[PDB]
Swiss-Prot record:
UniProt gene name: MTERF1
Subcellular location: Mitochondrion
Species for this entry: Homo sapiens (Human)
Effect of residue 251 to A: Reduces transcription termination
GO biological process annotation, one example: DNA-templated transcription termination
Entry protein name: Transcription termination factor 1, mitochondrial
Keyword match Transcription regulation: yes
Residues marked Interaction with DNA (site): 63, 103, 144, 189, 251
Known outcome of mutating residue 189 to A: Reduces affinity for cognate DNA
PTM annotation, UniProt: Phosphoprotein with mostly four phosphate groups. While the DNA-binding activity is unaffected by the phosphorylation state, only the phosphorylated form of the protein is active for termination activity. Functioning seems to be regulated by phosphorylation.
Family: Belongs to the mTERF family.
Domain notes: Contains nine structural repeats of about 35 residues, where each repeat contains three helices. The repeats form a left-handed superhelical assembly with a solenoid structure that wraps itself around DNA.
Amino acid sequence: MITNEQDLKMFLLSKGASKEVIASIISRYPRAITRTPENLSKRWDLWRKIVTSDLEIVNILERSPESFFRSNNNLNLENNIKFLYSVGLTRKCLCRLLTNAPRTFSNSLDLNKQMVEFLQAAGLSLGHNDPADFVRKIIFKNPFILIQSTKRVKANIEFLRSTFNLNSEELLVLICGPGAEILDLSNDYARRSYANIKEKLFSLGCTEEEVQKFVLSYPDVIFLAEKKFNDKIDCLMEENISISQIIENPRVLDSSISTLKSRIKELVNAGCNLSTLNITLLSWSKKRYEAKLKKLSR
DNA sequence: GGCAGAGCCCGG
DNA sequence: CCGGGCTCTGCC
């Protein structure tokens, strides 16, 4: 007769998918083979409400198969698309959500309604006439946000606000820009992350002011596990990069313990001036590092 | 963590 | 204006 795999191959070919991409994908997701011709075709039609071509859709399924084959809830999916569009999100935003936070659409419509309802309350109470732009800007900058609880999101905003003594305008920029991903963290973790940074930098001599600015200038520092932030700075000072230095160029903490290490062990171990070079290159790309250590030899 | 395009700033 | 070196920024 005809197998589960047969149906999906047929379907997928009729969408413009190479026999290879089809095989690729199929190996990666067993449960893909268990959706019906009908279900599939409705999911695809729905995805085409956002995605503009079957081609685009395909790339996605090739990088991200669970993205499509996970849920078989077309009604939920359909209502979320309707609702999200209705509150005035843009095709791009929905595409970004699709490709970054797919479970948004397998979500409960009530949940998304609740967060948008919240996001509206927030743009408002931050001195925004029409909160519509705020909501769009925040969802575009943090597409993982609709899959958070409003309690989490609500607490993290309050946390930023009072820790940092930010006003409405200052808080707004924070959460639509640098501190955006922060709202997706467990509140408790966020509260302990920053507590550790404070204790760790103070013990190195830093002031309140100096700490606030440090975290404000690169909020994603709060993501580092405590031991991993602690370990990392301990390393930078063994190589005797100065705290001031660590603080002035915060993104060096993006490198891993082993990488920055073995790179000054060639900038100072070879011959240069550590406490004068802006260690921005430290974090830099290999291709992008080698080429400056080049002009730095002479 | 690594990476490099887009755009920006500086010596020329 | 222009040619390169760097940052900011957002994808793998």
